[PDB]
Amino acid sequence: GSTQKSLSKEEIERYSRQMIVPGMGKEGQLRLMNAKVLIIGAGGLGCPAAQYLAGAGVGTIGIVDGDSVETSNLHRQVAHATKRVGMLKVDSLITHLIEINPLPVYVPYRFDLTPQNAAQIIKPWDVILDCTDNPATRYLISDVCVLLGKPLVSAASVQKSGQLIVLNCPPTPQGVVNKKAAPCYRCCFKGIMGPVVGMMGVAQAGEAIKILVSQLHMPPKEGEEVSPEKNLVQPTLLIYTYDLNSAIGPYSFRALKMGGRKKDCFACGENSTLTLDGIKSGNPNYVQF
Amino acid sequence: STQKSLSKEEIERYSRQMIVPGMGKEGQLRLMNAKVLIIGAGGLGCPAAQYLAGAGVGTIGIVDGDSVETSNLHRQVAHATKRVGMLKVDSLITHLIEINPLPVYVPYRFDLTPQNAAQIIKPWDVILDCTDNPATRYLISDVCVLLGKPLVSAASVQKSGQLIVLNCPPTPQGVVNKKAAPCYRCCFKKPGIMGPVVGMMGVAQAGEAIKILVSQLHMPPKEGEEVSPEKNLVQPTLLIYTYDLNSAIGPYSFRALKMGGRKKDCFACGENSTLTLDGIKSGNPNYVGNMTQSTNLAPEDRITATAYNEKRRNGELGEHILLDTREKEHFSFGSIPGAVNVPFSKFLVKASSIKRPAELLPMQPASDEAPIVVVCRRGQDSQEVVEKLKELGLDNGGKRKIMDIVGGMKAWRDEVDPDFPFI
Ligand SMILES: [Zn+2]
Ligand SMILES: [Zn+2]
């Protein structure tokens, strides 16, 4: 699955328009096709992210969700259909992804992600996208990504706005603080309109593609630092504010620069006591926020 | 004909969208009574239509004459592999019906041309330019100016895409005696693709269309009043999304440039314009890359708490004045060092009293180029302050920048000084 060294005749035609982009090419396309991307959440954030990773040809796409399609969510979950109401979101979404592009392998997880199964779900994947829109789950996914060394693309709905940030990319082992390292979600922190959540989801796919094509999740050359222009060690917190009574303004998008890994972070900092065994056993406890 | 109430089925489908502040039943009925035209059923048109269909726009028109091809599915995610060979408009409506069967979908199984542009556009309320074609983009803007239509235009290229709201609220051709929104010529005088880039701009197009309909941003202001500058209509924003495969989201990935209003000498909307609907039909404007540099970027009107502090720490803002418009007792709890307090309450009264000497509202100045920075509690009233100061010619014809701090003193606390004593 990750061993492709050639493109078939159908793949050349299907991906011809995007391979010609500078910085993509054949090497860029094979990196997508040999990649494994996990999408946690098949709703407003997960549907647009999945659609554009499917069209682009990511070779393996996992989707985690245990909920069902509902009529009142179609205005924002546009990958679903009215006739698929009552069906599992993961199955309804993959039905549309297969329509877009049947060449990738789609791996459904037909159940909720929890502290007891997070590590099992996340471990096999190269890049993690948090599309849960659940604050408690966000901390769980960040923690597990730190412990299993995974880059995390996390987005959320908050008030009348959306958010996006790339975390732990390139991943750095827990507790290492004698070098520049990317932050985790804890390092940074402590009714929704369709276009808002849709824009963050599309942005999430754009970032996952960036990481895989340019190998932004790979370490730098020995003794070399990660270029600050890559916006990885100190990532940007993107905040898009959407107000129904005001057309797009000069600061509807805010790009807040984040700090690097904190030395005293509960999860990734020095002397961290967070462990995979603890998470499984309820330590820490992810209280509903 | 106008629908005035909701059924049980519509309340279910739209319940979680109507609770959004500013939407409600009134906002929903405005969408369901609206008619939106989407020209182009491809990379930009698919996401735009998906989210307008889901939101419940009552009537959605789609113009396209091309067919679905395998090589474009990577960015045209509303189409299906099984529907390769079908007309794009027929393929797209099939998907839109699946999302939401309640709207009325109107296909135009042909391409827009100078000969049919006016006929196609006239019946529709809001126009979305989802063509990635320069020639068609100029043609649509021209027709929208002549027919008095608001236009949401987008474009995409290898590394970037753009979005801008034009001629909203619409103002007749040739009117130059008042503030008026620009057209595409006012903004850009004539000289591969990644899915996420075009998808981003397409979703943003639907977002703007929804805002225009729900808040009736395309309706004129009250007689004698100008459109609120805070609505970003008469001087719209040019959004630019730069997608660099070798760099994650950065400070300039999303760049929003403020545009000037209508140009007095615009070929299409300016005074003494020779452009007419019959001239377009006759080929008199000959609509010969996809994205070009703008030609009416306006001077900046706002600054972030972060940027203002960044310049203050490096001593960049020389000779400037900092006006704190919070009320007296609020200013007494603390302020930015060097801020002069000019309460907003008294400011509005003194400004009301200059309907007679010159500019006593303000305090001791220096030069003609000395910037003025306004800051209030949370950036709600500071734009109005800046707007009236310019109304009284205190920008000296544009040589003196007058800005406000985005988010007021709350943003100052959140972005710069977390221990600031904010009330
Ligand atoms: Zn951390
Ligand atoms: Zn013009």
Numbering used by the authors:
A (entry chain B): 2 to 191, 206 to 304
B (entry chain A): 3 to 193, 206 to 302, 306 to 373, 378 to 444
List passages from the publication reporting this PDB structure.
In eukaryotes, the ubiquitin‐related modifier 1 (Urm1) pathway is responsible for the synthesis of 2‐thiolated wobble uridine (U34). Uba4 is a two‐domain protein containing an adenylation domain (AD) and a rhodanese‐like domain (RHD), which are both essential for the dual function of Uba4 in sulfur transfer and ubiquitin‐like conjugation (Furukawa et al, 2000; Huang et al, 2008; Schmitz et al, 2008; Leidel et al, 2009; Noma et al, 2009). Uba4 activates the C‐terminus of Urm1 via an ATP‐dependent adenylation step, receives mobilized sulfur from the Nfs1/Tum1‐relay system by its RHD, and subsequently forms thiocarboxylated Urm1 (Urm1‐COSH; Leidel et al, 2009; Noma et al, 2009). We heterologously expressed and purified Uba4 from Chaetomium thermophilum (CtUba4), a thermophilic fungus harboring highly stable proteins, well‐suited for X‐ray crystallography and other in vitro approaches (Bock et al, 2014).
Interestingly, the structure reveals a homo‐dimeric complex of two protein units with an asymmetric positioning of the ADs and RHDs, which themselves form individual dimers. While the ADs and RHDs individually form C2‐symmetrical dimers, the structure is asymmetric since the two 2‐fold axes do not coincide. The individual ADs are formed by a continuous sheet of eight β‐strands surrounded by eight α‐helices and are highly similar to both MoeB, the prokaryotic ancestor of Uba4, and to ADs of UBL E1 enzymes (Cappadocia & Lima, 2018; Lake et al, 2001; Olsen et al, 2010). Like the AD, the RHD forms a dimer mediated by hydrogen bonds between active‐site loop residues Arg398, Arg399, and Glu405 occluding the active cysteines, which suggests that the RHDs are inhibited in the apo form of Uba4. Noteworthy, the RHD dimer mainly interacts with only one AD. One Uba4 dimer harbors two nucleotide‐binding sites, formed by conserved residues of both ADs (Gly45, Arg77, Lys90, Asp134 of one subunit and Arg18 of the second subunit) implying that AD homodimerization is essential for the adenylation of Urm1. Although Uba4 was crystallized in the absence of nucleotides, the highly conserved binding pocket enabled us to model an AMP molecule into the structure with high confidence. However, the function of this linker is undefined. We found that in one of the two Uba4 molecules, almost the entire linker adopts a stable conformation with a well‐defined electron density, while this is not the case for the second Uba4 molecule in the dimer. The structured linker closely interacts with the AD, and its residues, in particular Asn307 and Met308, are in close proximity to the ATP‐binding pocket, coinciding with the expected localization of the C‐terminus of Urm1 when bound to Uba4.
